[PDB]
Amino acid sequence: TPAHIAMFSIAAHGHVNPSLEVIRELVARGHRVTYAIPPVFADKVAATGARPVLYHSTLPGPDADPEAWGSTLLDNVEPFLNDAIQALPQLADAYADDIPDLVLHDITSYPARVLARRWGVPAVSLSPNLVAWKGYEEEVAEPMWREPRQTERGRAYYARFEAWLKENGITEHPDTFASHPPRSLVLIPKALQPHADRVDEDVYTFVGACQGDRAEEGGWQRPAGAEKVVLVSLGSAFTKQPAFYRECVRAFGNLPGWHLVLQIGRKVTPAELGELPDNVEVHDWVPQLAILRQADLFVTHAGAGGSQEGLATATPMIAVPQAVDQFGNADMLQGLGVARKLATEEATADLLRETALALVDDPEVARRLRRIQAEMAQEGGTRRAADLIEAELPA
Ligand code: NA
Numbered sequence: 089t090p091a092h093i094a095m096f097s098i099a100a101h102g103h104v105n106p107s108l109e110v111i112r113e114l115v116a117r118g119h120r121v122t123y124a125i126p127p128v129f130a131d132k133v134a135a136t137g138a139r140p141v142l143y144h145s146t147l148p149g150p151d152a153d154p155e156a157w158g159s160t161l162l163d164n165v166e167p168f169l170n171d172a173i174q175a176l177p178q179l180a181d182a183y184a185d186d187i188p189d190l191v192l193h194d195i196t197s198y199p200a201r202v203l204a205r206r207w208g209v210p211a212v213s214l215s216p217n218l219v220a221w222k223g224y225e226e227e228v229a230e231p232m233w234r235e236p237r238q239t240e241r242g243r244a245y246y247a248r249f250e251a252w253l254k255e256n257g258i259t260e261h262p263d264t265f266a267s268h269p270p271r272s273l274v275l276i277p278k279a280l281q282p283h284a285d286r287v288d289e290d291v292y293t294f295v296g297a298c299q300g301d302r303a304e305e306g307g308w309q310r311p312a313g314a315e316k317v318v319l320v321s322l323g324s325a326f327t328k329q330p331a332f333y334r335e336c337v338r339a340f341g342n343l344p345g346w347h348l349v350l351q352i353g354r355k356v357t358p359a360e361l362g363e364l365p366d367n368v369e370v371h372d373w374v375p376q377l378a379i380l381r382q383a384d385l386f387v388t389h390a391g392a393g394g395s396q397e398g399l400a401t402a403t404p405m406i407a408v409p410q411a412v413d414q415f416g417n418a419d420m421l422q423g424l425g426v427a428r429k430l431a432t433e434e435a436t437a438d439l440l441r442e443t444a445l446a447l448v449d450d451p452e453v454a455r456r457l458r459r460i461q462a463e464m465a466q467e468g469g470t471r472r473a474a475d476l477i478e479a480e481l482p483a
Pocket of ligand 1: 381382383384401402403
């Protein structure tokens with residue numbers, strides 16, 4: 089008689105993709121898994137074998153640019169409260185006489201936390217980004233929150249948040265409720281966790297290893313004259329670059345022994361790029377892994393899949409973030425001695441080239457990558473996380 093594990097997330101790729109493999113494995117293990125998700129991701133979720141439970145989220149669909157979330161931290165954070173308040177009852181009612189044995193959820197789902205409590209079952213939080221360490225509150229939250237909190241808006245945000253939890257028997261402060269889960273699996277490698285020396289390892293277990301995505305075998309496969317392959321697979325931060333994808337051509341084009349995979353405004357759109365040399369393939373859509381598995385350098389936006397897979401593929405990286413969060417990845421990657429940090433004003437054909445020739449020729453870069461790949465192997469992937477989830481399953 090199967091345990092019911094209820095998963096919760098929102099319609100955003102970065103909050104669904106990282107755990108799809110885990111959900112897939114839990115189903116493969118015989119658990120009955122339901123997955124609360126908006127309709128746009130129903131197909132995506134059903135493909136894991138989980139039953140989608142549909143609800144209406146007022147958050148921006150997975151198909152939205154980052155003008156659409158908002159410009160200050162209260163603009164970033166309020167939407168999750170607003171959504172949660174109108175999603176809670178939908179979800180409570182959809183699960184009314186089918187109370188799960190265990191609640192799993194991406195960090196964005198406030199309803200999941202509330203319902204786990206209301207139902208008196210354990211919740212397991214699944215983080216696709218870094219988590220709080222012991223000390224973050226004083227260290228980091230304050231000043232960041234220091235100002236918005238003495239504004240009329242921030243006092244009302246926090247007021248409404250209190251009241252809403254109070255409605256649901258919860259007395260934890262909202263910052264506690266939101267940012268400090270009792271139990272969490274962190275889906276990024278420890279190597280990419282700030283001040284990771286201080287994460288509480290009763291609460292949090294790191295499971296950041298590649299287990300999965302398209303584990304496909306063969307994507308594109310190296311032309312058998314390609315000494316050094318450089319995939320440029322998010323290298324940018326998704327913004328217009330009629331100079332950066334072209335700076336990449338000038339860096340690697342006709343560079344003896346090199347071969348350059350570019351991936352563009354992934355809607356085609358150009359004959360900017362111009363007179364492509366013979367060792368330069370450009371595409372709108374690539375299989376970042378089979379490539380990375382045979383690539384020797386990776387120019388990247390450096391988000392989770394991207395910082396992770398290059399580490400996972402022991403591929404040194406030229407870090408081209410263009411976002412404060414990936415500025416922390418960049419100096420973290422760079423901090424580990426396996427990448428050099430670059431912004432677009434900086435990522436010019438010359439400096440791309442000499443940095444590329446540094447990194448691929450640095451035998452210690454390779455040794456460090458080996459080191460990190462081994463630590464991620466240990467952390468475990470899908471089976472690992474699935475184990476940890478079972479180990480909670482009021483069973
Ligand atoms: Na490699």
